[PDB]
Design a binder for this molecule. Sequence first.
Ligand SMILES: Nc1ncnc2c1ncn2[C@@H]1O[C@H](COP(=O)(O)OP(=O)(O)O)[C@@H](O)[C@H]1O
Ligand SMILES: Nc1ncnc2c1ncn2[C@@H]1O[C@H](COP(=O)(O)OP(=O)(O)O)[C@@H](O)[C@H]1O
Ligand SMILES: Nc1ncnc2c1ncn2[C@@H]1O[C@H](COP(=O)(O)OP(=O)(O)O)[C@@H](O)[C@H]1O
Ligand SMILES: Nc1ncnc2c1ncn2[C@@H]1O[C@H](COP(=O)(O)OP(=O)(O)O)[C@@H](O)[C@H]1O
Ligand code: BEF
Ligand code: BEF
Ligand code: BEF
Ligand code: BEF
Ligand code: BEF
Ligand SMILES: [Mg+2]
Ligand SMILES: [Mg+2]
Lengths: 39, 155, 538, 521, 513, 99
Amino acid sequence: MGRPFIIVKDQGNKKRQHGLEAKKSHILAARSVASIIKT
Amino acid sequence: SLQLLNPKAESLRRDAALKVNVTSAEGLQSVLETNLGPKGTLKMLVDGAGNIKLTKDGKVLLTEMQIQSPTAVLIARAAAAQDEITGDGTTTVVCLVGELLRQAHRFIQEGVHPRIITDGFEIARKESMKFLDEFKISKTNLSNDREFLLQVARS
Amino acid sequence: SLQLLNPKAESLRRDAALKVNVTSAEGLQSVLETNLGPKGTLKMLVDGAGNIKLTKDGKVLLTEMQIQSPTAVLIARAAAAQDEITGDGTTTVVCLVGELLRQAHRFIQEGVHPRIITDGFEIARKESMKFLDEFKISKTNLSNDREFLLQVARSSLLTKVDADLTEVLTPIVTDAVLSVYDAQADNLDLHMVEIMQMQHLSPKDTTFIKGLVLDHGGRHPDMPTRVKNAYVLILNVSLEYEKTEVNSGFFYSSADQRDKLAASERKFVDAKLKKIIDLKNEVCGMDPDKGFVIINQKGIDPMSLDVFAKHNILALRRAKRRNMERLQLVTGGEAQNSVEDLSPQILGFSGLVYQETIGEEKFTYVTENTDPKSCTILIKGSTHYALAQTKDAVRDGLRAVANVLKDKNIIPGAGAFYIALSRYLRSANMNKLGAKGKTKTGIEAFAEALLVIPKTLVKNSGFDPLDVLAMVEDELDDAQDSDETRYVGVDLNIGDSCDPTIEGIWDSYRVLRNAITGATGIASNLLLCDELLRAGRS
Amino acid sequence: PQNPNAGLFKQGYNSYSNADGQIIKSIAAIRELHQMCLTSMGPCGRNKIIVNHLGKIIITNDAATMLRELDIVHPAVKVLVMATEQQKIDMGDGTNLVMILAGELLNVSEKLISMGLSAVEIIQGYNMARKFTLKELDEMVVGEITDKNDKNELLKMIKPVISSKKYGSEDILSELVSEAVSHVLPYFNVDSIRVVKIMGGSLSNSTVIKGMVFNREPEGHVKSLSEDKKHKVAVFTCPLDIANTETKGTVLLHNAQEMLDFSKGEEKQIDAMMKEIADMGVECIVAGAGVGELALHYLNRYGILVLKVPSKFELRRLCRVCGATPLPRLGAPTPEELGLVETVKTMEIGGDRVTVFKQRTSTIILRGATQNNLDDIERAIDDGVAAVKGLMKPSGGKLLPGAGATEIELISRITKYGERTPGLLQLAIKQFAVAFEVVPRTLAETAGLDVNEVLPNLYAAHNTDHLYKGVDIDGESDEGVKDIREENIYDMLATKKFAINVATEAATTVLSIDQIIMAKK
Amino acid sequence: VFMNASQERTTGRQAQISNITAAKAVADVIRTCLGPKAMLKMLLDPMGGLVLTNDGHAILREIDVAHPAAKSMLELSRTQDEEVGDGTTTVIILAGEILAQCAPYLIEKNIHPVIIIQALKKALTDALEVIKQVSKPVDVENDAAMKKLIQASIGTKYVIHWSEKMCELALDAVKTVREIDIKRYVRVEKIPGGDVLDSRVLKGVLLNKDVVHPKMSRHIENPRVVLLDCPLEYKKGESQTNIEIEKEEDWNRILQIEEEQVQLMCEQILAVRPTLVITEKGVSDLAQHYLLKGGCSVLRRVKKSDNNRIARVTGATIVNRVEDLKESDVGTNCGLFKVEMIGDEYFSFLDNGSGKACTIMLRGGSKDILNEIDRNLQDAMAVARNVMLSPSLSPGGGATEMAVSVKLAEKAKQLEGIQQWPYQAVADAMECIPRTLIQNAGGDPIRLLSQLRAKHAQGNFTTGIDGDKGKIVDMVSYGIWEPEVIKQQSVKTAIESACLLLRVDDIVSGVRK
Amino acid sequence: NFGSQTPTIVVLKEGTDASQGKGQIISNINACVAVQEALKPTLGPLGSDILIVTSNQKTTISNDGATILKLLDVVHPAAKTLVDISRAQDAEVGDGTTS
Ligand SMILES: Nc1ncnc2c1ncn2[C@@H]1O[C@H](COP(=O)(O)OP(=O)(O)O)[C@@H](O)[C@H]1O
Ligand SMILES: Nc1ncnc2c1ncn2[C@@H]1O[C@H](COP(=O)(O)OP(=O)(O)O)[C@@H](O)[C@H]1O
Ligand SMILES: Nc1ncnc2c1ncn2[C@@H]1O[C@H](COP(=O)(O)OP(=O)(O)O)[C@@H](O)[C@H]1O
Ligand SMILES: Nc1ncnc2c1ncn2[C@@H]1O[C@H](COP(=O)(O)OP(=O)(O)O)[C@@H](O)[C@H]1O
Ligand code: BEF
Ligand code: BEF
Ligand code: BEF
Ligand code: BEF
Ligand code: BEF
Ligand SMILES: [Mg+2]
Ligand SMILES: [Mg+2]
């Protein structure tokens, strides 16, 4: 019941940030941007 | 002796040259005798493009195929000269040089100078030609025989 | 259908399998007809090392070369099974299979089932074998005809070497076989066959020695070169320092105990030496004419060499493990192993033993023996390529004369036997059975196929092969209508008909007996195949 | 070890001799694509999704289309493929039966080749059986319906042909087909009916228009005399712009008095072109070629609709619906060569500003969701569209009892000719019959019924009310068959004629060969 | 990964086809090797030898097969040879056309495999009872009636030419190993050349060894024989003995113990008044002196398996311990010992009472074609040993097979239902042997199968095909009868085969371990 | 015959993918499920938005189903149906695309 499949195009080159652990990586990104300028 | 004039030259000498020629002509009659008469069999050819040619004609197999043997390409040119001047008999020529080379080789291998059999070929050819003039049946074609000419298409 | 079972499998199917087999045999015979008879031509061969072998011998070309064609390697196996069982005729088998497959092929391409010709091969082979038993001439060999046997060496050597080298080797071969054979009908070749080779002089220098010339000598400088009346001693038990098979290592605690042991390890050998000298004194002491010589299978210690050189003995070490037996049939005494059960009734005698030295190598002779049943063909020869070439000539004659003795018969040569078959088998095809018709063609081929030997002899001769054939064919019918049938073969010198009985050129029975049954067996098996397959693990 | 060669005359080939590549290796390579469309035959058959050489998706029930979209190697396989392409161009339907017969004609030929028969024996025996099959078919025909160009009879005829390609709605589709054909019939051109597919809605939302649909941009303004009716039309091959010559047009100006007069004279030069067309009472000009910006400006004021973009396709299929005649010479707008249209408005479908030419040549607007499936049901429509043209031309339209009834009566009737012939040839004629077991067998196998319990129940009921009995779908018919005379299920004679004939040629021609020779790519 | 990747799965009808395809195309490489008109498929092995024969199992044996269904098919001609000897060709042709006539015609009409297996299992129980009722029991010791057996079973491969001699060599080989036999007490030493008419079964054993000492006799009239399972040199301490010398004298006393140990053996060996002594292990150069004085010709290093062969002929028993050499262990009634010389190489003969082991001397025309005769004699000696165990004989030449056809063609019609289709296709399968026997002959199969099938129904069991003619022949009057167990096992495994491969619906590739 | 080896006539050209039976039907459903499952969040008042960066660095943020399914490059031929199924909804209606 296992077939190696191709749903989206160039599936091997597509990374997916998911759920909360994505939001952390998004907010902290903005955070770093902020530390550059806040001074 | 020859090998001194060109380091990279291929050559079949003496009795080997004769053997190559005969094996080849015997061989080319071996791949075309499947076509002789109505008892013959139909062959399917497919070229590198994927095109299906489908013919029992002798001159067809010879045009349609890539001949490599030099002694063989020479025999295929006799078949061309046949089809271009006669139309029919392009298979008769091939296996007539086959069995002709084959039957003559049976004597050269025994120890007979080829030139000896070559004259015997010509002196029989001249005879075979005088016999033909005397073996044919004269159909009055100036009278245009309706059904006799129907039995030549049918043949 | 086969290509599914294995993706990478070579196969030659149907009528191509026949062809591939026939073209190859027809071919092997095209590389091996340059050898047939004395009219043939010498070929030089150089292997990858650079070693020049130089022989016209059929089996030689085949063993000296790398064979790739499978149908070919099978034909070279009938040639080997010929040389190992007969000695001669290793070429006859190859081109007999050649023209046997060639002649059988002409009918199959005409549209004849192989099996039809196969039976026509056997039914002819059965007939050819009954014919042979009747064609041979019964030479009364139990009467040992001195010069008739001289004309079997001269017939078999000429087809391998010179015009003037053959007149030299002829007696040396014949006199060898004759110096082996016994009234109880035995001939254990390997004994009186000792082919010795020497690098010096010339191949036309070969000498017959009615004794045995060895490959070693006295390893001590003070030993005798010439022993006038040699009592030969044949020993095998090692005269050397040997440790015990159970671990030997010893212990000693005195500066003296060393030396009083240093001889205690040599004592065993010296006590074995004593019993020898005690015979060398009991037999020689009384006779200053009578000498004492040893030929030892195992070693002779340097400590023990100074011993034999002292008591004027001629010692000889590590002789061939077969020469024990050869010497017994040379001198007379049985080969003793132990020294402790040794009597003077066991000593063999040779009226002369001398040591010739060449550079640094030494050759111990055994001459003037009272009665020998074993001899030696001392092949002398300058180079190294000849020393094998003139050996491979002597072999093909020493086994050729011994076939005249083993078989109480012989067959007239020049290929008279084959011509006679080709005439007989062409006539009695209606007679043999009133045969299955189909069977008839198989004979008709096999029959006219045998004519190879004659033709391929005239081919080599240079004369017109089809012409000198018809010549023998013509002068035979002259005797066939004159009632008294006299043998007729091909004269290779003048390109004419001739009588091999008169010309003195003979050809062994067993050779022609295992030539036909071998060729038919391999040719009538090569036809019957329909596939050539290659499949197996990587 | 190592093996020698056989013969080197060529550059590097492969030869498939002893009829091997024909008697076995060919039959089985055909069986691979025989089992393919075996499960695509009939209403219970499954569609196959084929992604081509360029990544474009294609889904079809059709054998010929499904085979045309594949890349094929095996030469003897290619033979039956051109044969399915034969009956595609020459009948439209039966493409699946070409395969299913020829494939089995060879599949069942395997038991003969191994029995001990020759190649020339089976060839002649299949020829003697085909020539009988076509002869014993012509005397089973029912309802040679030829009620002129009847609209109610077309619906009964098309329903089964549509049904076995897209079983979803045989009713809702064939009504669209019949209605479009009804607007053309007064030889009934396949080309006289056009198909325009645009995404949106369902398969039911589909309509039939007594004219045409143009997905091109309209220009000046939309004709609202459409409500009032009776609009006049003119067509042009020429571009609606100042007529240039084919040879390089240079404009040599000498005096300054030329500049003003050229440019302002150009204004009038084409205003006068347009006026000679407006004064003829024309309300719609369809341009195949170009239109100048000055020329459309005057036409814009003269209150006339413009429809640029057509290639030669449209200019001919629009010509037949309005009844105009297109002239290349811009100087002759004749009243005897004008057209007449009932409505030319901007009806917006799926969001696209589309021009309509309704109320001869007609156009079906097939609507749905997937632009994929809509492509297939266009081929289903074209099957019946071409099935209608096949009724008109030949003198007899004619009808056969389908669903298997035609095929099973053949199994019985061909064997009857089998036992009459004695000789060795008898078996080839008898096996030719058993091969016809495939048409009902695949209909059953697609429905998921006991192959071993339907076929004996179908033969038994066929041994004159027996003539109609052929296999059916569902749980009550899981018992067996249905009286095909009552469900309005028939296929035509000219459909089964081309099929059984081309399939016998296709299976013969692969049996004619015994040595295939092929070259490297 | 989910599974392992790199795994090609073949499932359903797809997998089924692959098995029947291969199994049937296996029969194809041997179809032209059936019966009398059969050929010789010449084979190149991997490391450079050559094999060219007919013997079905010897052709397949030298072919490498990858597709498991054919790896299952080939290793199935092995079971056949390892049971009967002949019929290794047949088995695979049936195995094929049981899967061919049966499967595709009916697996591609939706019939489930497990019903088919039960249907084909009954068709065997039926087929065996048919063969055993169409066969006729034979006298196993009517020496001349048994030669007609062997005459028929060799009348296939290149050996026919000399059947009369071969049958005498086969029958006389099995006669002197018979309480029942094992044909591996029969060394078949092949000696190149001569001709077949020179081959002679020796009631005894032949060796390639020469007498170890020249003086020892090469001819003994009636030799008393001792056989030895032990070396004839002094043995060592198996306990890792090592000697530590202190005194001067010590050396000679020990170095003679080994000289004496042998004399203690020789005194014990010679104490049984022998004239011949043969050992499995090598013989010392001091042992020969005490056995020369004993008057015994000694043979060294002779094969372990050759000893059990000699001890059975000569009647002496082999003993490891020299100490306990008894009066029984000596060769009473071996009539001769000689060392005749067959051109270059020395061979030791042992000729002339109650034999139970035997050496077949073979002579031919090559070392290569000799093997192809041994392959025929092994197939000859087999058909003779079968019959002495199973005294009954089937009427062969396609006749036994056709018998199974119309008996099963009647039983199928009388069975009906769904189980009938597979059952009526083993009956279809049997006729494949006649079919290929007409073919290899060269007659029209359909024309002759017709005049065979119907001419069997009311024309006796023994109605089959004559090979060379290609016509119907009553096999009673002709003389082709194959042993009953061949026809038994042939049909047994060939069905057991088709019913192993049908259970396959799935092929998972890349499994490991 | 010319060749000592004569391989096997091919049905289709090397590199041709073929899938049959139950595998096929159930694989196509699962493939579709995948496209759906990832589009399932954007539904309803508390729906999640998706941030897609296309192969050409084009960064887009959306809740519009047709826009998400279009910017996703669906290759699977059976799951391309769900893109055409959403596209038709934007063409005739505008809303529903996700649903
Ligand atoms: N019905 C027939 N019976 C016997 N021989 C025939 C028949 N028809 C044609 N032939 C012979 O077969 C030959 C025709 O060969 P064909 O295959 O046409 O090749 P080609 O004529 O090019 O050599 C002629 O020589 C003719 O004599
Ligand atoms: N003087 C001669 N005249 C004619 N034939 C000869 C003569 N000497 C030898 N022969 C023949 O030559 C053959 C020997 O061939 P040879 O070259 O030794 O090869 P092979 O290994 O086959 O014996 C014999 O058949 C013999 O009859
Ligand atoms: N409603 C139906 N019920 C049962 N069988 C049908 C029905 N409609 C058509 N058929 C059968 O389907 C066959 C046509 O199959 P189809 O898939 O259209 O391929 P083709 O038309 O190319 O042969 C006809 O033989 C017909 O008898
Ligand atoms: N002369 C003959 N004519 C017809 N059939 C024969 C003849 N000899 C043997 N047979 C049949 O063919 C079989 C022998 O063929 P063979 O090639 O040896 O196959 P296998 O190796 O399986 O025994 C026998 O079992 C017998 O039934
Ligand atoms: F094949 Be031919 F030129 F009639
Ligand atoms: F070349 Be041979 F064996 F005399
Ligand atoms: F396969 Be078809 F032309 F409905
Ligand atoms: F060819 Be067999 F196994 F006798
Ligand atoms: F996500 Be949608 F187009 F309301
Ligand atoms: Mg259809
Ligand atoms: Mg919404």
